[PDB]
């Protein structure tokens, strides 16, 4: 549409690969840096979607 659709999303970060036909869904933040993080997106860990 003219205004620009954004409803469709796709993951970028994940712990590892997934077996075929995986049907589970999370908004949890992904920790990429060595230091663990919790709560919202911060340094060394960003939203995987």
């Amino acid at each position, epitope marked *: 549409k003219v205004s620009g659709n954004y409803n469709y*999303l796709y993951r970028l970060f994940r712990k590892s690969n997934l077996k075929p036909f995986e049907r589970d869904i999370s908004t949890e933040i992904y920790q990429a840096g060595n230091k663990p993080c919790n709560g919202v997106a911060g340094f060394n860990c960003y939203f995987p979607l």
Partner: antibody
Framework: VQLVQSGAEVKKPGSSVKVSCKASGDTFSSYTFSWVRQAPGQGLEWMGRSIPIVGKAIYAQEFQGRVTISADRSTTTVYMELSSLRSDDTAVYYC??????????????WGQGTLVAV | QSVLTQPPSASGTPGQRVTISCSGSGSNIGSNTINWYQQLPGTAPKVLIYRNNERPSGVPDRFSGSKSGTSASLTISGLQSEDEAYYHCAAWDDSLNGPVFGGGTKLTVLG
């Protein structure tokens, strides 16, 4: 679709303004409010457009920063914070639901408005 | 200041037809449709003509709008008591990548 904005706010210049509009009887995840500046008896002016998911947003072309977005899905509320206030900021904030198409774009309705004096 | 050039004020007696013209650029008016908004004083703005060919919620069909080149004109045939309102042009712009808006034209009801 009813949008409830904050009341009249008076702020000293160079200070910060916190204003929020609420989502009622609707899917806040599938609804977005794109805030619009409105000077009384004057033309409208877009500020920004955000989405509740992930939190990605786009701000005014003229201002790289100036205004920061935030959205809480649990409270179904959108918060806008303005910094480096100037005398030209005496105007109203109107929010705006986003027409159709999972409600991420275009304008259909507006909140009662938030008049701010600087 | 507005990219879309609207007249600042206009007048009209009840019953007659008046046009309001807003002009912009080819990237936002020549490449995109214009959207006409109406706003009663003291109240939230509404949408009067969208896509230049339809009304969002069964709005009086007496209202009309036209687009040509880099110009747009709202024509209303049926002036009435509470038609006093601010009317605005809105259109997406690729150069600014945002919705550029008009300066707003006040349509009044003459005695």
């Amino acid at each position: 679709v009813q949008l409830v904005q904050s009341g009249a706010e008076v702020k000293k210049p160079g200070s910060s303004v916190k204003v929020s509009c609420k989502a009622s009887g609707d899917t806040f995840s599938s609804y977005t409010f794109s805030w619009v500046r409105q000077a009384p008896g004057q033309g409208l002016e877009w500020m920004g457009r955000s989405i509740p998911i992930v939190g990605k947003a786009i701000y005014a072309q003229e201002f790289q920063g100036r205004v920061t977005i935030s959205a809480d899905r649990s409270t179904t509320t959108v918060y806008m914070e303005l910094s480096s206030l100037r005398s030209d900021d005496t105007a109203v904030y109107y929010c705006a639901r986003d027409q159709s198409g999972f409600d991420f774009f275009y304008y259909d309705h507006w909140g009662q408005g938030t008049l701010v004096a600087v | 200041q507005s990219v879309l050039t609207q007249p600042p004020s206009a007048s009209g007696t009840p019953g007659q037809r008046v046009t309001i013209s807003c002009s912009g650029s080819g990237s936002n008016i020549g490449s995109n449709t214009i959207n006409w908004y109406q706003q009663l004083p003291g109240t939230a703005p509404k949408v009067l003509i969208y896509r230049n060919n339809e009304r969002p919620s069964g709005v009086p069909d007496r209202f009309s709008g036209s687009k040509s080149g880099t110009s747009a004109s709202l024509t209303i045939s049926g002036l009435q008591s509470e038609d006093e309102a601010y009317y605005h042009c809105a259109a997406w712009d690729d150069s600014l990548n945002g919705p550029v808006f008009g300066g707003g034209t006040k349509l009044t009801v003459l005695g």
